[PDB]
């Protein structure tokens, strides 16, 4: 009945020293029934990464929508969109459906190519921006992720340390939520290299 | 299950170094009608306890009779009724708290919020809250209804934790209570100007003050306020 919790799933993003990390689980379900264990929730438009939790049809629709908009942006501007600008574009696009909203919990992550500054942001379903220094959480185990992140996180972690922190935050949160899990992906993002890691986790 | 009919608004209170202060206005409202202007909602029990009651007035008058009957019953076969076996604030509270919780558990509550303020045998300040659900809690400041939202913030600036109690005198505490009652008169639509205030001190005993009025009210700034935005006249 509640659209944001039919399919389930989670996204978490963190900042570190000259880097950001964004991670997601792989489950797609119909309430109790697990359907897919390959449903990735993180997409990228150039060097800007967008995670999306919530109703899966809207996750897919919004990915296609932001691909559309960032492609046109790039043709007109003659440069890739930056995280700060993209954040505003997500907010705009969500709020224009104020009274018939997409049932999603988007998370932006990336490094500004000019200033080199790590950047993360989160939104509610109608586009209110939460621009955190430390971390952003989203999905059906957002409470669990808030608890993990708030204790595990410390500022200025190196990329390979940040990987361990965000991975343990996701995995332990997911294991306390019925509608999350079934695999997980972690992106470690630096100014000009991005590593993607699939995590081993319990498959229940 | 019922609905409250004739009602009393905020009861406010706080601890100070040697005792407790409690206060409540003299109004019995009938919805938005300010029906009864002479209702006493602070009810003393002996010379060491005051029970301040908000909410339904018919249920208050019932509780008032239970406390009156409690004093009578304590005196029975009790040569020390006015000495070591006199009623304590903690006894009076626990009785009321038992009644309140029993009544909610039969789905027929006494529709009130109660604050028992007093001083114990050993000089310790007693201040505890109970309501229609049987929920109880103690704090250096306590308030019911609108008092919780407006009085507590002001009273907590004086006594913010336990260690502030010995530093607070009766003059400072009473001043804070009287100011809080004025603020409630500005902002609570179901309050009145006339109120009662009770001080229970371990040295000077029970001082019960009737027919107090909110005074030193700031209204003068109103004359300059014109329209709701663009009006100049």
């Amino acid at each position: 009945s509640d659209p944001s919790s039919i399919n389930g799933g989670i996204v978490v993003a963190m900042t570190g020293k000259d880097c950001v990390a964004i991670a997601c689980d792989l489950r797609l379900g119909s309430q109790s029934l697990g359907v897919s264990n390959k449903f990735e929730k993180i997409f990228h438009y150039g060097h800007v990464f967008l995670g999306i939790t919530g109703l899966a049809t809207d996750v897919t629709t919004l990915n296609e929508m932001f691909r559309y908009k960032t492609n046109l942006y790039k043709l007109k501007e003659e440069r890739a969109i930056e995280p700060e600008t993209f954040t505003q574009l997500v907010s705009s696009s969500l709020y224009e459906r104020r009274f018939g909203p997409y049932f999603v919990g988007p998370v932006v992550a990336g490094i500004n190519s000019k200033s080199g500054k790590p950047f993360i942001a989160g939104f509610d379903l109608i586009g209110c921006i939460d621009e955190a220094k430390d971390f952003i959480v989203s999905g059906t185990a957002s409470d669990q992720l808030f608890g993990m992140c708030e204790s595990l996180y410390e500022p200025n972690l190196e990329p390979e340390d940040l990987f361990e922190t965000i991975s343990q935050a996701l995995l332990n949160a997911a294991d306390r939520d019925a509608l999350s899990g079934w695999g997980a992906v972690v992106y470690i993002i630096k100014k000009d290299e991005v590593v993607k890691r699939y995590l081993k986790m319990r498959q229940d | 299950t019922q609905q409250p009919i004739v009602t009393g608004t905020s009861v406010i209170s706080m601890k100070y170094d040697n005792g407790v202060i409690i206060a409540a206005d003299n109004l019995g409202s009938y919805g938005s009608l300010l029906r009864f202007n002479g209702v006493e909602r602070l009810i003393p029990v002996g010379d060491n306890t005051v029970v301040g009651i908000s909410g339904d007035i018919s249920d208050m008058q019932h509780i008032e009779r239970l406390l009156k009957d409690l004093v009578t019953e304590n005196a029975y076969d009790n040569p020390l009724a006015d000495a070591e076996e006199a009623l304590e604030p903690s006894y009076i509270f626990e009785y009321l708290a038992t009644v309140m919780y029993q009544r909610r558990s039969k789905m027929n509550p006494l529709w009130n919020a109660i604050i028992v303020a007093g001083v114990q045998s050993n000089g310790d300040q007693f201040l505890r809250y109970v309501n229609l659900l049987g929920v109880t809690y103690s704090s250096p400041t306590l308030a019911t209804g609108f008092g919780a939202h407006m009085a507590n913030p002001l009273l907590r600036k004086v006594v913010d934790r336990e260690s502030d109690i010995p530093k607070t005198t009766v003059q400072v505490a009473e001043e804070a209570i009287v100011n809080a009652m004025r603020v409630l008169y500005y902002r609570d639509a179901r309050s009145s100007r006339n109120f009662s205030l009770a001080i229970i001190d371990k040295n000077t005993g029970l001082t019960f003050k009737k027919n107090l009025q909110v005074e030193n009210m700031k209204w003068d700034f109103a004359k300059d306020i014109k329209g709701y935005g663009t009006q100049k006249i």
């Binding site: 409470d143 669990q144 993990m148 204790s151 | 299950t1 909610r104």
Partner: protein, 222 residues
């Protein structure tokens, strides 16, 4: 319509060590967006080296603790001052809770102490009396925030031996009382940051063979 239940917020946490147990709880009591009290004790010494907390609706919590304390008193009278073991206390609490199966006590109950071999014990109850013995349990408002952390830090879940690829789990250990209290304090500091109903103060009751000791710590008051 009259609603007999309410929500007084708060959060509690039980952790069982090797020869000790802790039961911690925040001291804030709330209704809606108002603070009722910044220091209202929620975790109680019940006698016989058992500590108890019933978090949720405070009136039902107080009623239950009151009834259990009385159950301990009458257990002494009826059975020649015999010590009520933690397992026996747990079963007794099930019957108290299930006795109101069709008008429940709106509380999450945790007790802690030592079992009959002297080892640390925590028991955890749902509102109608289902219980299990556990090494670790948070209850109340911020239980969702705290429990995944305890899975990770007390039971070493999802943690592997480095360099083993991912085939040797981190081996389970008992924690020292000093280590447990560090995890308790950090759990509540974290929970206070992100949950509006958690704050003001943290009271920890520690149970050993020597008895019941208390510790108190300040938490953020916003």
């Amino acid at each position: 319509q009259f609603n007999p239940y309410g929500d007084n917020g708060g959060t509690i946490l039980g952790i069982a060590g090797e020869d000790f147990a802790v039961l911690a709880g925040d001291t804030r009591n709330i209704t809606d967006y108002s603070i009722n009290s910044r220091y209202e004790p929620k975790v109680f010494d019940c006698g016989d080296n058992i500590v108890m907390s019933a978090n949720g609706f405070a009136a039902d919590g107080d009623a239950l603790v009151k009834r259990f304390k009385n159950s301990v008193k009458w257990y002494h009278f009826d059975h020649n001052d015999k010590k009520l073991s933690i397992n026996s206390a747990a079963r007794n609490i099930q019957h108290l809770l299930y006795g109101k199966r069709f008008f429940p006590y709106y509380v999450h109950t945790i007790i802690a102490g030592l079992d009959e071999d002297g080892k640390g014990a925590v028991y955890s109850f749902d509102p109608v009396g289902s219980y299990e013995r556990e090494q670790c349990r948070a209850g109340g408002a911020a239980a969702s925030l705290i429990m995944p952390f305890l899975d990770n830090q007390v039971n070493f879940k999802n943690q592997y031996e480095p360099g083993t690829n991912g085939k040797v789990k981190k081996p389970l250990k008992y924690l020292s009382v000093e280590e447990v209290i560090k995890l308790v304090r950090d759990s509540f500091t974290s929970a206070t940051e992100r949950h509006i109903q958690v704050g003001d103060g943290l009271e920890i009751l520690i149970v050993t063979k020597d008895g019941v000791r208390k510790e108190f710590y300040e938490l953020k008051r916003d």
